[PDB]
Amino acid sequence: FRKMAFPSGKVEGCMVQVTCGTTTLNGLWLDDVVYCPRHVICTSEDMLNPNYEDLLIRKSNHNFLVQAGNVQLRVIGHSMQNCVLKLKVDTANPKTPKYKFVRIQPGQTFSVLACYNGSPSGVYQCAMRPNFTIKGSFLAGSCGSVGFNIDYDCVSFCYMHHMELPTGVHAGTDLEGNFYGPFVDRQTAQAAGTDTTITVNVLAWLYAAVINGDRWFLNRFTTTLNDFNLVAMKYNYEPLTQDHVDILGPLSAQTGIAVLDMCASLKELLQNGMNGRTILGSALLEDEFTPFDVVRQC
Amino acid sequence: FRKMAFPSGKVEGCMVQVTCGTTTLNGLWLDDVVYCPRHVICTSEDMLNPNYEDLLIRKSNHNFLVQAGNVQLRVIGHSMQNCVLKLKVDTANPKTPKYKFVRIQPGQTFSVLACYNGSPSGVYQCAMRPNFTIKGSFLAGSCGSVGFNIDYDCVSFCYMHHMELPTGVHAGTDLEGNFYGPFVDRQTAQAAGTDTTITVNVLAWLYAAVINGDRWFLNRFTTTLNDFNLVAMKYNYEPLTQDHVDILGPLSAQTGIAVLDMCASLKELLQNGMNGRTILGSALLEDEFTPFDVVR
Ligand SMILES: O=C(/C=C\c1ccc(O)c(O)c1)O[C@H](Cc1ccc(O)c(O)c1)C(=O)O
Numbered sequence: 001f002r003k004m005a006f007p008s009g010k011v012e013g014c015m016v017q018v019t020c021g022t023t024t025l026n027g028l029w030l031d032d033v034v035y036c037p038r039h040v041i042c043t044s045e046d047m048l049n050p051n052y053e054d055l056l057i058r059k060s061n062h063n064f065l066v067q068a069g070n071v072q073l074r075v076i077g078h079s080m081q082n083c084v085l086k087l088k089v090d091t092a093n094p095k096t097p098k099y100k101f102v103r104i105q106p107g108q109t110f111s112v113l114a115c116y117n118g119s120p121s122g123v124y125q126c127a128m129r130p131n132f133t134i135k136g137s138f139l140a141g142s143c144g145s146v147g148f149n150i151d152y153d154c155v156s157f158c159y160m161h162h163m164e165l166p167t168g169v170h171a172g173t174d175l176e177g178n179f180y181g182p183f184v185d186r187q188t189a190q191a192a193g194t195d196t197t198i199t200v201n202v203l204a205w206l207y208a209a210v211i212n213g214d215r216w217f218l219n220r221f222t223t224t225l226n227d228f229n230l231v232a233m234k235y236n237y238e239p240l241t242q243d244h245v246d247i248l249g250p251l252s253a254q255t256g257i258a259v260l261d262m263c264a265s266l267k268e269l270l271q272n273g274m275n276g277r278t279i280l281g282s283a284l285l286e287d288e289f290t291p292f293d294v295v296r297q298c
Numbered sequence: 299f300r301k302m303a304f305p306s307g308k309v310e311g312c313m314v315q316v317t318c319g320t321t322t323l324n325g326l327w328l329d330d331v332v333y334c335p336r337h338v339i340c341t342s343e344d345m346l347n348p349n350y351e352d353l354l355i356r357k358s359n360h361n362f363l364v365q366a367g368n369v370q371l372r373v374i375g376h377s378m379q380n381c382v383l384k385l386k387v388d389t390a391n392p393k394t395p396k397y398k399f400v401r402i403q404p405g406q407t408f409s410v411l412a413c414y415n416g417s418p419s420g421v422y423q424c425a426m427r428p429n430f431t432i433k434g435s436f437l438a439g440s441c442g443s444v445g446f447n448i449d450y451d452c453v454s455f456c457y458m459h460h461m462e463l464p465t466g467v468h469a470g471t472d473l474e475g476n477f478y479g480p481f482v483d484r485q486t487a488q489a490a491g492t493d494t495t496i497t498v499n500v501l502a503w504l505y506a507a508v509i510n511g512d513r514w515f516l517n518r519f520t521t522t523l524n525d526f527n528l529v530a531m532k533y534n535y536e537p538l539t540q541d542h543v544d545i546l547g548p549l550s551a552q553t554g555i556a557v558l559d560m561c562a563s564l565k566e567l568l569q570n571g572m573n574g575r576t577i578l579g580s581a582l583l584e585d586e587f588t589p590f591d592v593v594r
Contacts, residue, residue, distance in 0.1 A: 002435035004420030007411065009307025114302060122302030123421060135579055137300030212466070281433075284581055297420075297435065 001208055001280040003288065004297070005111040006150045008123040013095030016073065017118025018087065018144065019065040026115045026144030027066065027087070028160070028175070031096050034066055034073070034087040035175060036144045037162045038080055039185045047187040056080055067118060068093075082177025083162065083185050099155040101175040106130045107198040107238070109290050110147040110158050117141050126159075127201065127288040130238050131193040132181025133169035134159070146175070165192050198287040199237045200244040203262055204294045205286045207251035209279045211298045216277055218257065221264040228263045235270045247291050299506065299578035301586060303409040303423040304448040311393030314371065315416025316385070316442065317363040324413045324442030325364065325385070326455070326473075328394050332364055332371070332385040333473060334442045335460045336378050337483050345485040354378055365416060366391075380475030381483050382458065396452040399473040404428045405496045405536075407588055408445040408456050412437055425499070425586040426457075427467075428536050429491040430479025434459070434468040444473075463490050495585050497535045498542040501560050502589040505549035507577045514575060516555070519562040526561040533568045545589050 018027040018036045021043065027036035039047065041055050041063075059078065064087055066073040077088035104110060106128050114122045116139045126134050126147060134147075138161070147159030162172045162185055169192050171183045183190055206217065229239045245259045252259050266285075274283060316325040316334045320341065325334035337345065339353045357376065362385055364371040375386035402408065407425045411418050414437045424432055424445060432445075436459065445457030460483050461469040467490050469481040481488055504515070521529075527537045538561065546557045564583075572581055 002422045002433070004412065004422045004435055005303055007306045007310050007418040007421055009305075009310040009418075012305050012307040113305065120305040120307075123305055124300050124302045135300070137302060137579070297437070 001205075001212065001286075001289075001297075003125045005123045005125040006148065008111065008113045008120065010097040010150065010153075010155050011113045011146065011148055012120045014093060014097075015113065015115050015118055015120055016066055016068045018085075019067075020059070020063055024117050025141065026118055026146075028144070028146055028157070029066075029068060029073070029089070029093045029096075030099060032089055032092045034075075034089055035160070036085050036087070037160065037173075037185065038083050038085040038177070039162065040085060040144075044187075050186060052080060056085075069118075080177070083173045083179060084160065084175065084177035097155045098153055099157060102149075102156045102158050103174040103176075103178065104128055104158045106132060107201060107290070108158075109288060109293055110149050112136060112147045112159070112161070113145060114139055114142050115145045125288065127198060127290075128159075128180065129169070129192075129195050130198060131195045132183075133165060133171055133192045133195075134161075136161075136170045138164065138170060147172075165190065167192055194236075197235075197237045197285070199232055199240045199266075200247065200291065201287040201289055202237070202266060202285050203240075203244075203248055203259065204251065204291040205280070205289050206262055206265060207248070207255055207257070207291075208289065208294045208298060210255045210257060211251075211294075212280060214279055217265045217269055217274075217279065218261075219265055219268060221268075222258065222260045223264045223267055224260065225263075228260070228267060231267045231270060237270070250295060251291060299510070299580075301423045301584075303421045304446065306409065306411045306418065306421040308395040308448065308451075308453050309411045309444065309446055310418045312391060312395070313411070313413050313416055313418055315365040316383075317365070318357070318361055322415055323439065324416055324444075326442070326444050326458070327364075327366060327371070327387070327391045328397060330387050330390045332373075332387055333458065334383050334385070335458065335471075335483065336381050336383045336475070337441070337460065338362075338383060348484060350378060354383075367416075378475075381460065381471050381477060382473065382475035398452060398454050400447075400454045400456050401472040401474070401476070402426055402456045404430060405499060405588065406456075407586055407591060408447050410434060410445045410457065410459075411443060412440050413443045414439050423586065424457075425496060426478065427490075428494045428496060430481070431463060431467040431469055431490045431493070432457070432459075436462060436468055445470075463488065465490055492534065495533070495535045495583070497530055497538050497564075497585075498545060499585040499588055500535075500583050501538075501542075501546055501557070501564060502549060502592040503578065503584045503587045504560055504563065505546065505553055505555070506587065506592045508553045508555060509549075510578065512577055515567055515577065516559075516563050517566050519566070520556065520558050521562045521565060523558065523561075526558070526565060529565050530568070535568075549589065549592060 027034040061075040064075040074090040325332040359373045362373040372388040459470045
């Protein structure tokens with residue numbers, strides 16, 4: 001059962017390079033606006049304790065160099081929305097897809113198009129961790145790379161990369177500039193919180209194992225949401241809510257395994273291991289498929 | 299350290315749908331040729347014992363319906379090269395990238411754009427397994443989906459999907475229609491041989507780990523090449539050849555760890571497991587990064 005990323009072509013045609021003085025990063029060119037992290041206007045010195053409103057007042061359109069491949073785009077206005085810089089440019093991107101800006105919840109998945117100085121390098125499938133970071137392999141100079149989902153030709157942009165945290169994970173904002181997680185765009189001391197496993201996604205993945213004919217972990221037992229969540233506590237799993245149960249409702253109706261029956265399976269796997277067995281050819285429990293991801297690919 | 303697929307846009311613009319009778323699958327539209335699996339001309343029954351020369355001689359150009367989005371392409375010639383059908387069409391694809399066809403070897407990696415009925419659905423990064431199969435995620439009807447690498451904006455096409463094997467793995471051809479492995483485009487009892495781990499790829503990834511500052515799995519031992527292979531083959535690891543040792547030369551020089559010293563570390567990892575630790579971002583020994591991948 002392979003993780004898959006969305007086809008990235010619609011996003012590839014929006015990636016540009018944004019340069020302000022000595023700093024170069026990636027920007028997103030949609031219609032006549034280029035979106036990028038506001039810390040592009042900061043000198044390493046500024047990063048220490050920036051006043052972004054002031055730093056931007058001292059900037060002019062001529063301070064921004066935007067390049068779309070071989071072509072310079074002329075900036076004709078600049079503004080900020082939260083942590084995102086918005087550069088109005090002279091030309092509308094003729095490759096702008098149908099798109100929306102959306103904010104996702106921890107545990108949800110998206111694809112990231114990793115870019116180096118405006119040029120797309122690779123694409124991978126992510127989950128937003130419960131601690132609001134992304135475990136990403138990242139190029140040098142990937143700031144401003146974006147995360148997205150695609151639904152019927154409409155690109156839903158959900159993430160823009162802003163920073164690497166000391167533990168090697170990544171932190172960013174939605175496309176309206178609101179941070180995911182308790183992080184700020186400053187060179188200060190900050191660290192990811194202790195992470196947990198995304199329980200509703202593990203359950204979804206066990207449903208995928210059953211749809212694919214791996215059934216050995218199924219047992220006769222059921223459990224209670226409360227009894228399960230105390231077991232979840234001890235193994236650093238996110239608490240499971242009635243919301244999560246209803247979301248798994250389709251897979252429970254499709255496979256015949258009630259969610260609390262599957263929870264009894266997961267509780268046993270957590271307490272006793274896999275006894276040398278494998279689930280979808282894996283010895284570890286996967287938590288970066290959502291229930292939606294599983295219904296989609298199955 | 300995440301497995302990344304190549305950006306798929308250059309291939310998305312080449313995917314089309316090919317229909318012959320009641321059979322529909324994916325085709326690849328490059329210049330004025332559409333490439334697709336020749337079993338598009340078969341019904342399910344034909345698959346037991348297809349005679350492709352007989353099935354194809356009975357077809358004319360208008361028996362092939364090619365759709366590129368909302369536009370029908372007119373087929374104006376056809377021919378078979380090994381196991382791929384080549385449909386000549388009216389129109390050169392305006393979105394044809396710089397491209398080439400390359401036949402890869404087991405252990406090599408590539409991205410696969412998985413498609414249903416001509417529309418791209420997802421992209422993932424692959425290794426050609428030592429048993430010449432792909433551990434894919436095939437949608438129903440993903441036949442004709444292609445595998446590729448992209449190097450300096452030139453797309454190297456190396457794989458086209460033809461068959462599902464009974465174990466859930468996938469078999470296919472290069473773009474000249476020659477199957478990878480002993481498989482055929484016929485519904486026989488063929489099965490993937492025992493899969494092995496790509497040893498040279500695990501060792502390259504261990505060097506990646508050391509370059510990025512993980513050293514906990516190193517030890518003070520070395521090994522002969524032959525002692526290493528005697529042990530590794532007991533874990534279903536591929537034998538390591540002197541070519542592989544040479545290939546790891548650069549990463550050895552970069553890290554100051556002799557290749558056979560890294561082999562000793564692998565031997566101990568296989569003996570001990572990870573003891574709850576991780577190497578790059580993983581709790582398993584990763585074998586789908588090549589030595590070429592790691593230098594990048
Ligand atoms: O796809 C077909 C071909 C034709 C077909 C075409 C229209 C039908 O209504 C029908 O029932 C069958 O059959 C397959 C060939 C094939 C396609 C995709 C695979 O993944 C595979 O393993 C084999 C088979 O039986 O081996």
